Design brief:
It is classed as transferase. 6 copies of one chain form a homohexamer. Chain A is of the alpha/beta class and 244 residues long. The first copy, chain A, is globular, with a radius of gyration of 18 Å. Helices cover 27% and strands 36% of the residues of chain A. In chain A, the strands form 2 sheets. The first copy, chain A, has a 7-stranded mixed β-sheet with strand order 3-2-1-4-5-11-10, sandwiched between helices. At the D-E interface, helix 7 of D face helix 7 of E. The structure holds S-adenosyl-L-homocysteine (6 copies) and magnesium ion (MG) (2 copies). One magnesium ion binds next to helix 6 of chain A.
Chain lengths: 244, 244, 244, 244, 244, 244
């Protein structure tokens, strides 16, 4: 597990070129949540499992004081490099999100790009509990998650990446095995291959809300970058608002 | 909605011939639950949304004192007819399960064949609350639910039924539109057709346990007629045990 | 052929409830075309193969002087009924679009909802030629077209419609056989069924442009209700602008 | 079973319009087999399970003396009617092919259009045994066989036929349940529907040969109207040649 | 051909980890067959095409005197290694099963895991003939057989295996081309790949029986580890019982 | 782009072994066109984008005086090598087909195997214009084109090729991204991989005829190696006849 965040860390931004191309639209939505859902001015944000800091840097660019936390130093290495290149001041920390000990010191806490799926029910409750403890009164928690083999390609410099994704689902226990073979091709034909194989957890929007309402005064479920939920939306946002 | 239980009531057992052919194995499992999970002797059972009483009669046949409740008299008419023909004594009552008012008088309450899907979150909570009140200490609540067009046929007397089912899912709001066209063919080619169109709710096993855990001391999740849950099971059983 | 416009005419608006629900967004786009693409003020519009007048009435409601033409009186009957009920003054005429003889008297000519598909190459050229002759200098022609069995349902009063669609394509000759079985169910189960079976022609956006550029000074291809064309758009609009 | 040959007999030729359009191509092949595989002159032919006599009539028209045998009078009625209309002399008899008692009476025995699928292993042996008895030395036995829901349509006069086929396969016992809903639509929308539900047997080319070799000194397997078998052929022909 | 048994021999047990996890369940069934179908005591067993001896070892472990025969030394090397490690006495021989010359020497002869698919009709007869010669009166012959691209993965120590299977079928000649790309990934990304490309033969339960009945006084067809055959079983077992 | 014609040039004929195995039938058709459609005797032929010269050599072998032109020297190297080995005299030239300047000097111009797809509308017009100039009166222009991942394999010497193809279509702009991963496996498992990634253009038969009709007196559309077009043909041939 975590092959994507260690050995493939330097290729993460390449693999997720699309996610980056639309980070601005996503943070526009996040700021609307800060403005309409939060019950306090949002200035300091804790971005959990920040990875290479794609949304982290976008938030920083807009004036937020951001602290990013990630389990893997290989990912943080990339985030710090980009922050330095863009003259953005962000505090990047290594650590497990389940072990944070911040106490009512962030106006908002975020977890971007389906990361709640890495946690089972017990760990998710632990996470939400720690997030609630990290928030200032009226602060908000924001996290997004989604509803044979597929092949695609990207390119980093002279290296071409051919990626093949497939999944194995176990509905009864709400588990999903996400597999991704990444082949890195050099100009002369030499190849290197790495296999991502992570166990993920499947949750419905209602499930997350039920688990979250236990830690936040109010929880909202939104879809498709709008502060509303439509029947056919395919990506969801859970917004937890701390009592003020 | 409810076309299947009103206009098509007399055709229900024909449409669900398969469900009937395996009711004995299902009740064998239910008795195992009464034995291993219930904390009191099970004698009096309340079967909610009993329909034509397929599992209701099988329980009665084994000596249980059963009370069956259903919203539609058309379904109850079939249940009573079969009970009479089989010399089984069962009290069949018409009524909404959400309006029951029984108090500490049933050793076990059941709801067979995916009927929880007819209730949204709010009504499901209301249902579980009333079920808990109806149960006696150590009593158990048992209910089962599942994980373009598909056509199949059955026959009742001289009439042949061609059934076409299809679904429309709204994932965001966890809603499912179950559509079923039932064509009834007579020997001379004359046809009568009826459209079933019910709005159903989509729940995961974890989700139901969460909503139920609030009303029962303990809640268990089982699969495929075994007091355990395997990764690939496709039919689930939720068992609520009243504190004893 | 044309079963949908004769025997099923009174059910057309029911079958296409969705098309109606979004006619306002479509005419908003049409007016943007009038404003930005036309080289003259648009007041009088000829709506060819107007059917039940869905977009025809919407245009009339907005102040345009509209003339609607359709081959089938059964469709016009519906259009006139709705126009009268809404106090909209529209001149509805019966006739073949390939036989129009209007001479430079319309500011714009429209053909809505994939109707160019009913015409093969030769007839399409004839149509475009007649449309060009009907337009005032700087006027515009606007028409939209799209890129096992599928079942769905609608309802008109007490009647329920179960619709099954399937197609048979002949790529070599760019022909498509559009088939639709419409079953009309009455409350007591009695049913009436009609089969739509029309031969349609398949065209690419570039094909239509090449055929249209021969009759209009300038032709534009737009997609998805925007005066631009994106790689993945699935519905197209051809806009022909007459020399001014 | 047999609904297609009784209640739907008068619609058989309509449903199998294509099977008819290429009957000449098929008989050309059959004659090639008489000429190259038969070790005697073929004059008198016994066409088993002749149905509406589609190939039976084509043979007679070419000078062959043919006797057609079928279990259903409803099918023979159509065959005789066509034989009469085309002034072709053919002896059409009603009877079960498993009960024939002919002996050294025919130069060739045929069974067209996948009918062997109606007989299980035991009955197929009985049939082959009877066919061998009916043949004259050097005579030949010829029969063809192939390797949802799917909806299609046809038309007979003013009546339109909408046909929906689907199958249920039992691989272990090599059984196939072929279902076909035939809806007959009148111009005014009135409908008549019949359900075809036959149990068929699945055989591979190898199987048939192994079963036939026991009764014919020589058994050949051909495909796609050629006296050869290619790896990807999808329609097979078994030819049994009686010892001369 | 045979790439899986030569170049990939040391990876066979990894690729077929599941086939191994249920070897005990399979031998339980095999013993049931020895006990109920064999007309003599089974002590000495000949396991044809034994491979890495997965079932061979399970039999020996239960007291049977087993002789394993395989064409490839690379596979036997693995079997002997495991036999040694588990201190099991087994005589592993290299040789072609089509060339065995045993006579009235074994109480039972086995061929596990679909290997009959490697032989065409002619060679399958030769094999069955040899097996019959090798058996003692009342002895039994047992063999199982079943009814893309698909990608899956496994792991042996630090090496990860990504396997991609696809097939090319020739229905007419009942041939199957089974292709499998096995990519072996080292932790540093280095890769080794081998392509499995075997020609296999397609047989139905009926076929095998017809071919076997010629050499065994009694031939039975079973499915899903039970001495019975159900309509939907997908894995079959052929049991040949020598005349006693 | 062009990876297939540069780095993989020496593997082209192996990858397209099938295309080669049927070149004779294709040239048989081409000669029929020279005979029935050309209005002059065909002796000198210009084969544009000749590649490794598969059809080029077949034409030369039949006595035609051929000039082959290709953008990539790597492909021409293979063509010249084969011509030399087969003692065929052909003039192979390097160059862009869009830059040809031949005038009234070829009896026929050809472009085999879907190469028109490499040109957008503008370049295709430019190409047809230059082809017309290169032809002599009554001369003919002939070109053929077709109507997740798919894996297959081939072999060149000791090297095995596993090829995985997939496509990404942009219907609105009629663009297609043809992707092909070619993995070259050596006996010891070592691998070399190359990614083909070309942008292609999608045209219908009618569309090509429209663009061509502008440069040739007559243009014909044929399908499946016959001087006619059938409804279900999947490969098309466009034939331009210069006015004679
Ligand atoms: N327990 C845990 N604690 C901290 N980070 C974790 C974690 N489990 C997973 N992660 C981190 O989850 C991240 C998922 S990738 C998503 C990255 C980033 N938020 C974005 O929007 O692009 C990885 O960087 C991984 O290292
Ligand atoms: N609110 C409600 N109260 C009581 N019955 C209800 C109900 N909503 C739906 N039902 C009943 O739900 C039943 C579903 S059919 C399943 C029937 C039966 N338990 C069996 O196992 O076969 C119908 O008989 C319907 O009338
Ligand atoms: N040759 C022709 N002349 C006039 N109308 C024609 C025609 N061929 C088809 N039609 C008409 O094409 C219409 C297609 S239905 C689309 C209707 C309408 N424009 C809308 O947007 O809803 C039918 O009303 C049919 O009668
Ligand atoms: N036991 C049996 N004896 C005689 N005919 C039989 C039969 N079982 C089925 N059939 C006949 O099988 C026929 C199959 S339909 C094929 C008909 C015809 N040979 C053709 O080529 O078109 C039906 O007409 C049916 O009545
Ligand atoms: N003609 C032949 N003679 C002996 N073994 C053969 C053979 N053709 C194929 N095989 C062997 O067939 C085996 C198939 S693999 C199945 C192995 C083993 N019986 C099990 O149950 O796991 C390979 O080990 C291969 O070497
Ligand atoms: N602009 C251009 N000018 C010349 N050749 C071109 C070209 N664009 C692509 N090609 C050539 O297109 C060829 C396509 S491969 C088809 C090759 C050959 N006609 C056959 O039938 O097998 C390649 O050899 C490539 O180099
Ligand atoms: Mg845990
Ligand atoms: Mg025409």
């Amino acid at each position: 597990m975590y092959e994507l965040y260690t050995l493939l860390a330097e290729y993460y931004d390449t693999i997720y070129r699309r996610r980056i191309e639309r980070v601005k639209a996503e943070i526009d939505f996040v700021e609307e949540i800060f403005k309409e859902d939060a019950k306090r001015e949002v200035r300091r944000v804790l971005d959990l499992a920040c990875g290479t800091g794609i949304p982290t840097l976008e938030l920083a660019e807009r004036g937020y004081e951001v602290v990013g936390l990630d389990l893997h130093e290989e990912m943080l290495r990339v985030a710090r490099r980009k922050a330095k290149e863009r003259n953005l001041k962000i505090e990047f920390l290594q650590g497990d999100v389940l072990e944070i000990a911040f106490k009512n010191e962030f106006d908002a806490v975020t977890m971007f790009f389906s990361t709640i799926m890495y946690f089972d029910e017990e760990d998710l409750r632990k996470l939400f509990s720690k997030v609630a403890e990290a928030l200032k009164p009226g602060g908000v928690f924001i996290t997004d998650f989604p509803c044979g083999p597929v092949v695609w390609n990207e390119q980093k410099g002279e290296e071409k990446l051919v990626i093949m994704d497939w999944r194995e689902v176990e509905p009864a226990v709400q588990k999903l095995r996400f597999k991704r073979l990444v082949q890195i091709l050099r100009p002369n034909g030499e190849v290197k291959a790495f296999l991502v194989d992570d166990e993920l957890n499947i949750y419905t929007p209602r499930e997350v809300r039920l688990l979250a309402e236990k830690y936040f005064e109010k929880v909202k479920i939104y879809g498709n970058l709008k502060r509303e939920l439509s029947p056919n939306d395919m990506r969801y946002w859970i917004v937890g608002i701390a009592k003020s």
